[PDB]
Amino acid sequence: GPSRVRQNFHPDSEAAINRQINLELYASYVYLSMAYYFSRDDVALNNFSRYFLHQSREETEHAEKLMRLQNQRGGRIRLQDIKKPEQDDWESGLHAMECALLLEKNVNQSLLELHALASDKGDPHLCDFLETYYLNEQVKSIKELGDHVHNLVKMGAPDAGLAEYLFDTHTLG
Amino acid sequence: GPSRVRQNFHPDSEAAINRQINLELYASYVYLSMAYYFSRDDVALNNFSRYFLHQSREETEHAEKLMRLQNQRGGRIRLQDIKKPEQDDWESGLHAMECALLLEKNVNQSLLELHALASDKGDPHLCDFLETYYLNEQVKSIKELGDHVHNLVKMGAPDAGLAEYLFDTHTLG
Amino acid sequence: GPSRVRQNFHPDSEAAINRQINLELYASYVYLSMAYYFSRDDVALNNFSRYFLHQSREETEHAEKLMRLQNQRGGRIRLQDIKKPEQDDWESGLHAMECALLLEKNVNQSLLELHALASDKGDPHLCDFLETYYLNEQVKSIKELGDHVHNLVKMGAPDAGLAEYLFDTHTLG
Amino acid sequence: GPSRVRQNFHPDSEAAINRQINLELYASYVYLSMAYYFSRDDVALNNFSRYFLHQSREETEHAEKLMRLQNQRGGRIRLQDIKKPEQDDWESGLHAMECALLLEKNVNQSLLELHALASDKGDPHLCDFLETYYLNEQVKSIKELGDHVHNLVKMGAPDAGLAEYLFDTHTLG
Amino acid sequence: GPSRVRQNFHPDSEAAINRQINLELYASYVYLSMAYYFSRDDVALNNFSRYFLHQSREETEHAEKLMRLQNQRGGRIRLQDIKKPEQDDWESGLHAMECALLLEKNVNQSLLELHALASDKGDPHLCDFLETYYLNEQVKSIKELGDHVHNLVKMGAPDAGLAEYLFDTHTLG
Amino acid sequence: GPSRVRQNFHPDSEAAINRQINLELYASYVYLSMAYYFSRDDVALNNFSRYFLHQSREETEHAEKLMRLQNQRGGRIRLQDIKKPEQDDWESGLHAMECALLLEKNVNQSLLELHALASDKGDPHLCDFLETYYLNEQVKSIKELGDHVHNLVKMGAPDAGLAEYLFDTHTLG
Ligand SMILES: [Cl-]
Ligand SMILES: [Cl-]
Ligand SMILES: [Cl-]
Ligand SMILES: [Cl-]
Ligand SMILES: [Cl-]
Ligand SMILES: [Cl-]
Ligand SMILES: [Cl-]
Ligand SMILES: [Cl-]
Ligand SMILES: [Cl-]
Ligand SMILES: [Cl-]
Ligand SMILES: [Cl-]
Ligand SMILES: [Cl-]
Ligand SMILES: [Cl-]
Ligand SMILES: [Cl-]
Ligand SMILES: [Cl-]
Ligand SMILES: [Cl-]
Ligand SMILES: [Cl-]
Ligand SMILES: [Cl-]
Ligand SMILES: [Cl-]
Ligand SMILES: [Cl-]
Ligand SMILES: [Cl-]
Ligand SMILES: [Cl-]
Ligand SMILES: [Cl-]
Ligand SMILES: [Cl-]
Ligand SMILES: [Cl-]
Ligand SMILES: [Cl-]
Ligand SMILES: [Cl-]
Ligand SMILES: [Cl-]
Ligand SMILES: [Cl-]
Ligand SMILES: [Cl-]
Ligand SMILES: [Cl-]
Ligand SMILES: [Fe+2]
Ligand SMILES: [Fe+2]
Ligand SMILES: [Fe+2]
Ligand SMILES: [Fe+2]
Ligand SMILES: [Fe+2]
Ligand SMILES: [Fe+2]
Ligand SMILES: [Fe+2]
Ligand SMILES: [Fe+2]
Ligand SMILES: [Fe+2]
Ligand SMILES: [Fe+2]
Ligand SMILES: [Fe+2]
Ligand SMILES: [Fe+2]
Ligand SMILES: [Fe+2]
Ligand SMILES: [Fe+2]
Ligand SMILES: [Fe+2]
Ligand SMILES: [Fe+2]
Ligand SMILES: [Fe+2]
Ligand SMILES: [Fe+2]
Ligand SMILES: [Fe+2]
Ligand SMILES: [Fe+2]
Ligand SMILES: [Fe+2]
Ligand SMILES: [Fe+2]
Ligand SMILES: [Fe+2]
Ligand SMILES: [Fe+2]
Ligand SMILES: [Fe+2]
Ligand SMILES: [Fe+2]
Ligand SMILES: [Fe+2]
Ligand SMILES: [Fe+2]
Ligand SMILES: [Fe+2]
Ligand SMILES: [Fe+2]
Ligand SMILES: [Fe+2]
Ligand SMILES: [Fe+2]
Ligand SMILES: [Fe+2]
Ligand SMILES: [Fe+2]
Ligand SMILES: [Fe+2]
Ligand SMILES: [Fe+2]
Ligand SMILES: [Fe+2]
Ligand SMILES: [Fe+2]
Ligand SMILES: [Fe+2]
Ligand SMILES: [Fe+2]
Ligand SMILES: [Fe+2]
Ligand SMILES: [Fe+2]
Ligand SMILES: [Fe+2]
Ligand SMILES: [Fe+2]
Ligand SMILES: [Mg+2]
Ligand SMILES: [Mg+2]
Ligand SMILES: [Mg+2]
Ligand SMILES: [Mg+2]
Ligand SMILES: [Mg+2]
Ligand SMILES: [Mg+2]
């Protein structure tokens, strides 16, 4: 108290990073839920399942990088409960993709708020960290999900019998 | 309703598997907390950190295998909040190992209760699943942690200045 | 309207990116003009030609990266006419290098203005994009052209009979 | 004045080659526009995008070969503005293919007019150049685009939800 | 006067970069002093020596990158005397590590001040340069030294006879 | 006091070695200054820059070997400030080479004085060390610089426009 490493690291930034860690862990859990929805016997879209599982693992990596940042800067990780996702039944491939797009935009907004706080506190290391490892990746993820939503809508998902199947086998395959 | 795949799968077993999924996810989170405790600048035992991180990832795999089992048998995954661990500050290498041993025994007791329920419901597939993938692994984990606790105690942890350092560098290295 | 991907992306930034796309395409065209000046039978400096052709292709890549950014962020590309360069006859190796240096400084000033707008609009993704892919590259290009102008001046270009020839064969070779 | 290389090269041919250079650069720009239309989040047909990008680059190569011809024969390149394409929004995969077919026929007509001028001026080198590098390539391009238009029409583009998607993934993939 | 390359480069930034060059050269010299302290016959901790020598060489690289930046931006390097370190006798492995941690924090503070000046002068190229090559590296160095100080303190350095020896042979080996 | 290793090592020799360490570090700094003079945008002789940078690194190695000798013999390194070089602007390739030749002769004279002291104190180990690692290397360096000065003078440096450029590209390339 303080850490022998701590420098130019505001307590508000430390707290905001703890909040972001929880949100990335929550996102990981939402994608985990989606992954195992798509491997139900009455859904059986294995490539949607693999897509969401990969996204889940990426979110865990994002959480871990923030935990490492907390330690690097001499802050103290404070974990909270990881809330369950809003649904177990994700209804359709299109619905899951739409929910994932909304989740990614919400996480993006949180990251932009974190960056604005880091700017306000004159913490260029934290600003650079978010820019280098988070902001670019979030924009790419949002774009990819937007693309997938568009194709599924155009193809006639969820009601058109062939749309999610063909998307599963071509795009996600 | 029911699943076209469901057979000899009691609703109580389905619910018990959902409870076990939550407990494995909780264990994953406890070990994640421990991993990042050991990479604090004022702890700095990197091999303890890597040990706990590996345990965290194993618990996620255990959770996922149960989720796959739920789908295979035609049950429906129902996720709940993942409670935060009991501590962020795990005090010492020995304390963390002792807490991990207790956690593993508690998870073991839950698995034995699950096996007893599966037996009572005449579900040999579920009994076999727990025996093949869980019970053996739990006994090995408990034994390993017992071994680590013993050596740390004998070496004079946590107060002896060299004990956790030497254990970090030899056994966990 | 708006794009399902669009977030924190101001219309002024979208318009400024369209202006920058046109300027990079214009730069590509200036360097293309220079490349084919140096392969005239009455100029015949093949390494100057290859140097400018490479610069032309780089500018097209810079334009394309901005077009991709526009799509990633949910803006809409709006192309305009690519104005012809100021000259077809670039007079000499030194003159071409001096014109290229001026062009690069002018494009740099535009990029700095874009960055200032992105800052004003609180768009750290766009700020990071320009910093990562544009600002560094522009400074290196300006420095390289400054170096080439200096050596050509010192060597006695354009009037000294051996200067552009020797520069063509050593530095650009 | 004249070039020490110039021989049997009529001023009208020199001017016509400059006009053709501009038209090939214009075609390159139309295909560039189309490429980035197909990577919009609300179009998201990546293989259409890659197809048009490849066509764009080919047109630049066609422009460059004419610029090299101008220099080889001792003419002087005179560049003009590259007009923006007729649209930024290309409406659909089928519409883009139909516009590309029309563009290729228009460029073909220009090349045939160039060949007729070269014939009239008794310039067999220029006639041979167009025959060897242009006329054959144009016929193949027109045929390919005709084939793609036919399949898209037959499949029910643009309104049939699966047609452009399936064409993107099979033919252009 | 000014450099033909200079653009958006304030004289205060140029002077601040010259000051930072001197500080990095000074840090290189402090670590050089420490390296050869640890190879004294009455200290003889070869891995501490190699650790500090490596840090010395890194600081020279940091100085050189700033010198290159000065030239890239058209500023003029102005070198000053490199002051001798505060000690020749660094007392112990722990003391050296503590002095190195303080040095790194002091250099970090200078870099943050440089970044704040670059921000104030609207120099995003210089801001990006410090973020990309300096700020991240400084945080990692401070964290590593904090970790080493902690382990040496816990192990009972400097008075405990085995602590620096065991640290030399395990962590730095 | 004395070192358990010290034998036949006079205090005057120990002090003279400390003086020589400072002079080699000073030479390293002069060559560093020269290296970055040659990469200025208004000098831009990259091979002169690389030549001087290599010489700088060699001088650091010479300093380090003396520091190791001090430790080997049980003397104590005492560092002093490294004075800045006499110039930041080195005027021309020829001027830099002439200044480097003078520096090398001055360092040589210091080494000969050190050898004479070692002889006077009956220290054949120190005499052998200077002969084996220093005297030969100094003579070769002086000869190389003499050769470079001669060619630059003969070629008409610094005023002849092609001389330093051609020397940069042939001899130093
Ligand atoms: Cl702080
Ligand atoms: Cl909570
Ligand atoms: Cl800041
Ligand atoms: Cl898609
Ligand atoms: Cl849509
Ligand atoms: Cl059943
Ligand atoms: Cl709960
Ligand atoms: Cl049974
Ligand atoms: Cl053990
Ligand atoms: Cl015990
Ligand atoms: Cl040991
Ligand atoms: Cl927006
Ligand atoms: Cl216009
Ligand atoms: Cl911002
Ligand atoms: Cl140059
Ligand atoms: Cl000049
Ligand atoms: Cl003619
Ligand atoms: Cl026009
Ligand atoms: Cl003919
Ligand atoms: Cl086809
Ligand atoms: Cl048809
Ligand atoms: Cl300026
Ligand atoms: Cl001073
Ligand atoms: Cl700025
Ligand atoms: Cl450590
Ligand atoms: Cl401590
Ligand atoms: Cl003695
Ligand atoms: Cl002094
Ligand atoms: Cl002797
Ligand atoms: Cl020579
Ligand atoms: Cl001479
Ligand atoms: Fe992803
Ligand atoms: Fe990843
Ligand atoms: Fe990945
Ligand atoms: Fe994330
Ligand atoms: Fe709840
Ligand atoms: Fe995400
Ligand atoms: Fe930045
Ligand atoms: Fe394990
Ligand atoms: Fe495993
Ligand atoms: Fe394992
Ligand atoms: Fe487990
Ligand atoms: Fe709670
Ligand atoms: Fe476990
Ligand atoms: Fe059994
Ligand atoms: Fe059994
Ligand atoms: Fe370039
Ligand atoms: Fe490139
Ligand atoms: Fe390149
Ligand atoms: Fe550019
Ligand atoms: Fe005009
Ligand atoms: Fe450029
Ligand atoms: Fe920034
Ligand atoms: Fe030559
Ligand atoms: Fe083609
Ligand atoms: Fe081609
Ligand atoms: Fe091709
Ligand atoms: Fe063409
Ligand atoms: Fe127009
Ligand atoms: Fe074409
Ligand atoms: Fe380091
Ligand atoms: Fe390095
Ligand atoms: Fe390194
Ligand atoms: Fe440094
Ligand atoms: Fe002093
Ligand atoms: Fe440092
Ligand atoms: Fe950055
Ligand atoms: Fe050991
Ligand atoms: Fe040398
Ligand atoms: Fe050497
Ligand atoms: Fe060497
Ligand atoms: Fe030397
Ligand atoms: Fe002085
Ligand atoms: Fe020397
Ligand atoms: Fe000898
Ligand atoms: Mg939250
Ligand atoms: Mg429970
Ligand atoms: Mg413009
Ligand atoms: Mg036309
Ligand atoms: Mg200072
Ligand atoms: Mg001296």
Spell out the SS3 assignment of C92-138.
Answer: CHHHHHHHHHHHHHHHHHHHHHHHHHHHHCCCHHHHHHHHHHHHHHH
Q: Is B133 exposed, middle or buried (0-12, 13-18, 19+ CB in 10 A)?
A: middle
Q: Are A131 and C124 in contact (CB under 8 A)?
A: yes
User: Do D168 and D48 touch, CB atoms closer than 8 A?
Assistant: yes
Q: Are D148 and D160 in contact (CB under 8 A)?
A: no
Rounded CA separation D80/C88 (Å): 10
DSSP state of A92: S
DSSP string, F58-111: HHHHHHHHHHHHHHHHT-------BPPPS-S---SHHHHHHHHHHHHHHHHHHH
Q: Which of E44, E85, E33, E163 is nearest to F3 (CA)?
A: E44
Angle at C137 between CA C131 and CA C140, to 5 degrees: 130
Residues F49/F57, Cβ–Cβ less than 8 Å: no
**Structure-block tokens of residue A166:** 């063909």
| Residues shown for chain C | 173
Residue C171 contacts residue E103 (beta carbons within 8 Å): no
Question: Which bin fits D156, alpha (ψ -120 to 50), beta or left (φ > 0)?
Answer: left
Ligand 20 centre to CA of E86 (Å) is: 77
Return all residues near C100 (Cβ < 8 A) that are at least 6 apart.
Answer: C30, C31, C34, C52, C55, C145
Task: Give the closest residue to F31 by CA, choosing from F86, F110, F111, F113.
Answer: F86
Q: Cβ(C44)–Cβ(D5) under 8 Å? A: no
d(CA C173, CA E107): 42
Instruction: Please give the C-alpha separations between residue D173 and each of A50, D169, E94, F65, in angstroms, as whole numbers.
Output: 22, 5, 62, 63
Contact assignment for D162 to A155 by CB distance below 8 Å: yes
CA B105/CA B100 separation, integer angstroms: 9
Structure tokens belonging to residue E102 = 């303080």
- Rounded CA separation F58/F24 (Å): 9
Q: Which of D163, D143, D156, D8 is nearest to D72 (CA)?
A: D8
Omega of the bond leading into C11 within 30 degrees of 0 (cis): no
On whether C24 is known to bind a ligand per the annotation, the reply is: yes
Max CA separation in chain B (angstroms): 62
Give CA–CA dist C82/D126, Å, rounded. 28
Q: Minimal CA–CA distance to C151: which of F128, E169, F40?
A: F40
CB D90 within 8 A of CB D73: no
Task: Match 């949607």 to its residue by tokens.
Answer: A48
Tokens found for residue A81: 């409960």
Pick the closest to residue F111 from F71, F62, F147 (CA basis): F62
Contact E126, E119 (CB under 8 A): no
**Which 3 state secondary structure label does DSSP give F147?**
helix
Q: Which residues pair with E163 in a beta bridge?
A: none
**For residue C171, which amino acid is it?**
T
What single-letter amino acid sits at B91? E
Cα(E157)–Cα(E92) distance, rounded to whole angstroms?
A: 8
Q: How far apart are CA D15 and CA D4, in angstroms?
A: 19
Q: CA–CA separation, E81 vs E79, rounded Å?
A: 7
The token pair that represents A135 in the structure block: 């902001």
Round to whole Å and give the CA distance between F3 and A43: 81
Helix H or strand E encompassing C37: helix C11-37
Q: Considering only CB atoms, which chain C residues are within 8 Å of F161?
A: 154-156, 160, 163
Chains F+E touching (3+ CB pairs under 8 Å): yes
CA dihedral E2, E7, E8, E13 (to 10 degrees): -60
CB–CB of B138/B104 below 8 Å?
yes
* Rounded Cα gap, residues B62 and B116, in angstroms: 19
Structure token pair of residue F54: 């290599």
Distance (Å, whole) CA E129 – CA E68: 11
Sign of CA dihedral A86, A89, A95, A97: positive
Which value, in Å, is the radius of gyration of the alpha carbons in chain A?
18
Find the distance separating the first CA and the last CA of chain D, reported in whole Å: 52
* Three-state DSSP class for residue A82: strand
Query: Taking each helix axis from N to C terminus, what angle separates E93-120 and E136-155, rounded to the nearest 10 degrees?
Result: 160
Q: What gap in Å lies between CA A23 and CA F86, rounded to an integer?
A: 59
Residue type for position E99: C
Calpha distance F87→A4 (Å, rounded): 41
* Touching C: A residues 103-132, CB under 8 Å: 105, 108-109, 112, 115-116, 119, 127, 130-132
Place of tokens 């040990």: B51
Integer Cα distance of D112 and D106 in angstroms: 10
Q: How far apart are CA E164 and CA E141, in angstroms?
A: 20
* Cβ atoms of residues B46 and B39 within 8 Å: yes
Q: CA geometry: angle at E29 spanning E129 and E89, to 5°?
A: 140
Distance of CA A49 to the CA centre of its chain: 16
Sequence-distant (≥ 6) Cβ neighbours of residue F11 within 8 angstroms: none
Contacts of F154 (CB under 8 A, 6+ apart): none
Length of chain D: 173
What's the CA gap between D97 and D75, in Å, rounded? 35
What 3-state class would DSSP assign to E139? helix
The answer to whether the beta carbons of residues E5 and C143 sit under 8 Å apart is yes
The CA radius of gyration of chain E, in Å to the nearest whole number, is 18
Whose structure tokens read 């038209």?
D23
b/e per residue A126-146 (b: at least 16 CB within 10 A): bbbbbbeebbbebbebbbbbb
Nearest-Cα distance to chain A for B5, in Å, is 7
3-class DSSP state of E82: strand
**Residue D86 among known ligand-binding residues:** no
For chain A, the first-to-last Cα distance in angstroms comes to 52
Contact of C55 with C148, CB cutoff 8 Å = no
Question: Taking phi first (over 0 means left), then psi (-120 to 50 degrees means alpha), and beta for anything else, what does residue B156 get?
Answer: left
Residue type, D99: C
In degrees to the nearest 10, what's the CA dihedral of D124, D127, D132, D137?
A: 180
3-state secondary structure of C82: strand
Chain C residues 31-60 with CB within 8 Å of chain D: 33, 36-37, 39-42
H or E element that contains A11: helix A11-37
B67 near A36, Cβ under 8 Å?
yes
Q: Quote the CA–CA distance of F31 and D93 in Å, as a whole number.
A: 63
DSSP 8-state code for residue C160? S
Residue B18 near residue B77 (C-beta atoms within 8 A): yes
User: What's the rounded Cα separation, in Å, for the pair E169 and B43?
Assistant: 19
Pairwise CA distance, residues D134 & D128, whole Å: 10
Distance between CA atoms of A50 and A91, rounded to whole angstroms? 17
Residues annotated within a binding site of A for Fe cation: 24, 59, 62, 104, 138
Contacts 24+ apart (CB under 8 A), E118-121: E118/E13, E119/A124, E121/E10, E121/E12, E121/E13
CB E147 within 8 A of CB E104: no
Q: Compute, in angstroms, the gap from residue D109 CA to the centroid of ligand 18.
A: 20
Tokens of A75: 């802050």
> Tokens for B17?
């598997």
- The position carrying tokens 């020829």 is F94
- Helix C46-73 and helix D11-37: axis angle, to 10°? 30
In 3D space, the residue among D9, D17, D6, D7 whose CA is nearest the CA of residue D114 turns out to be D17
List the beta bridge partners of residue E131. none
Distance of alpha carbon A14 from alpha carbon A3, whole angstroms: 13
* Domain ranges across chain C: 11-171
- Ligand 40 ion: residues within 5 Å (CB): B 58, 61
Q: Which of A3, A5, A72 to mutate to test the interface with E (most CBs of E within 10 A)?
A: A5
Contacts of A21 in chain B (CB under 8 A): none
How far is it, in rounded angstroms, from Cα A24 to Cα A64?
9
Buried b vs exposed e over F73-101: b needs ≥16 C-beta within 10 Å? bbbebbbeebbbbeebebebbbbbbbbbb
Q: Measured between alpha carbons, how far is A167 from D169 in angstroms, rounded to an integer?
A: 10
Chains F and A touch (3+ CB pairs under 8 A): no
CA–CA gap between residue F60 and residue F31 (Å, rounded)? 10
Peptide bond into C85 cis (omega under 30): no
Q: What tokens does F150 get? A: 């001669």
* E163 contacts chain B (CB < 8 A): yes
CA distance A104 to A111: 10
**HEC assignment per residue over chain B:** CCCCCCCCCCHHHHHHHHHHHHHHHHHHHHHHHHHHHCCCCCCCCHHHHHHHHHHHHHHHHHHHHHHHHHHHHCCCCCCCCECCCCCCCCCCHHHHHHHHHHHHHHHHHHHHHHHHHHHHCCCHHHHHHHHHHHHHHHHHHHHHHHHHHHHHHHHCCCCCCCHHHHHHHCCCC
Q: At what angle do helices D46-73 and D11-37 cross, to 10 degrees?
A: 160
What does the DSSP 8-state code read for residue E79?
-
Q: With contact defined as beta carbons under 8 Å apart, do B94 and B149 qualify?
A: yes
Q: What angle do CA E102, A74, E134 make, to 5 degrees?
A: 60
Tokens 């609180």 belong to C122
How far apart are alpha carbons E111 and E107 in whole angstroms?
6
Q: Label residue B159 exposed, middle or buried (CB < 10 Å: 0-12, 13-18, 19+).
A: exposed
Instruction: Tell me the two tokens of residue B71.
Output: 């789908």
Sequence-ordered alpha helix ranges (H) in chain E: 11-37, 46-73, 93-120, 124-130, 136-155, 163-169
Q: Phi then psi for A61, rounded to 5 degrees?
A: -60, -40
Binding site feature residues of A: 24, 59, 62, 104, 138
Three-state SS letters, chain D: CCCCCCCCCCHHHHHHHHHHHHHHHHHHHHHHHHHHHCCCCCCCCHHHHHHHHHHHHHHHHHHHHHHHHHHHHCCCCCCCCECCCCCCCCCCHHHHHHHHHHHHHHHHHHHHHHHHHHHHCCCHHHHHHHHHHHHHHHHHHHHHHHHHHHHHHHHCCCCCCCHHHHHHHCCCC
Q: Which residue matches tokens 């670590």?
A: E31
CA dist A71 and A74 (Å) reads 5
> Distance between CA atoms of D102 and E89, rounded to whole angstroms?
83
CA distances from F17 to E31, F31, F69 (A): 20, 21, 9
CATH of A11-171, one of 3.40.50.300, 3.40.605.10, 3.90.226.10, 1.20.1260.10: 1.20.1260.10
Among chain D residues, CA nearest to A146: D41
Side-chain half-sphere exposure of C42, counting CA atoms within 13 A: 14
Shortest-distance ligand to the CA of residue E8: 22
| Rounded distance between C-alpha atoms, residue A7 and residue A140, angstroms | 32
Structure tokens at E147: 């970790």
Q: CA D86 to CA D81: how far, in whole Å? A: 15
